Amino acid sequence: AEQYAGEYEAQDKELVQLKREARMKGGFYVSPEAKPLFVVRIRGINAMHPKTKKILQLLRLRQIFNGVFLKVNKATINMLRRVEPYVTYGYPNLKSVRELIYKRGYGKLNKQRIPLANNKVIEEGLGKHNIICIEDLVHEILTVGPHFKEANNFLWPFKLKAPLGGLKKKRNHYVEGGDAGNRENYINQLVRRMN
């Protein structure tokens, strides 16, 4: 992750200095993105059209401050832009996910939910993709490689806390100083208030 930025540090040299005193940009090189998403439901099921309501159920979001991780797809973000004022989303970094799965983790259905406490994360949970234990699971899901959309296959809701320091207003999208919709940087900030 750090070496990606280090690669463009070495190669690029045209981006930084002169360009503040000018508009446009030149050539050189480009850093890719490849990010799964995390979706937490800001706004309730009250007073919204029912096609969008079905989507919340489909991606499971069953109460406010429910969380489920989503993959890398064109289709997935087409689906989320019918839901956009009712959810907030973006990628939370590798580290933040690790320190959140522990807190509000539970088991998966195939039984009920027996949680990710001492004995019961070692001896319960299936996994045929990889080791199903907490730290292993986070590593595989967010690298989004082979059969790690089945290293998704979640508990089924992360029951997030309401955010410390509160929300930004519910009535607006991300651009207008609201909370709702896509933003990679500030979703992890929000989820680290919802510990």
């Binding site: 099921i45 309501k53 919340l56 159920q57 069953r62 109460q63």
Partner: protein, 163 residues
């Protein structure tokens, strides 16, 4: 909360050991099955438990005809598990034997089946010697047939254009 969340709370409830089980013998028998099923590997005995729970008004009488017809050398004289009762409206002298076990037998059946061959076994013995529930067919019995699907009332239930 949710409507999604309410969906989980409004789920199924077929579930019942019957509204009233008057018969003490039925009631103790299902306890015997209840004990053995969770202490054994048997899928089959678990199926028996459900069929002896919810209703008796659903348990089907099975004639000697058709019982005979599916054990026709493609089941080599196994054990026929009959949920309801054997009834005797046939004469062929059936199969030259067969071990038939049931919840109930008619008085005529007790005489007739054993004098054709094998033995009229009780369900108490079925539980005893096969908690494992193997080499066994739940033979049959219908009520879904020509008479009394939705074919009720006075004048049935129709071909179907209007009713």
């Amino acid at each position: 909360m949710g409507i999604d969340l309410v969906a989980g709370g409004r789920n199924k409830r077929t579930k019942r050991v019957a509204p009233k089980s008057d018969d003490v013998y039925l009631k103790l028998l299902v306890k015997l099955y209840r004990f053995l099923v969770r202490r054994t590997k048997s899928k089959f005995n678990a199926v028996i438990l459900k069929r002896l729970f919810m209703s008796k008004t659903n348990r089907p009488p099975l004639s000697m005809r058709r019982l005979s017809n599916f054990m026709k050398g493609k089941e080599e004289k196994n054990i026929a598990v009959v949920v309801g009762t054997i009834t005797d409206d046939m004469r062929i002298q059936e199969v030259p034997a067969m071990k038939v076990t049931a919840l109930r037998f008619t008085e005529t059946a007790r005489a007739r089946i054993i004098n054709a061959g094998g033995e009229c076994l009780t369900f108490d013995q079925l539980a005893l010697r096969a908690p494992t529930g193997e080499n066994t067919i739940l033979l049959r019995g219908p009520k879904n047939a020509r008479e009394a699907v939705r074919h009720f009332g006075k004048a049935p239930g129709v071909p179907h254009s209007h009713t």
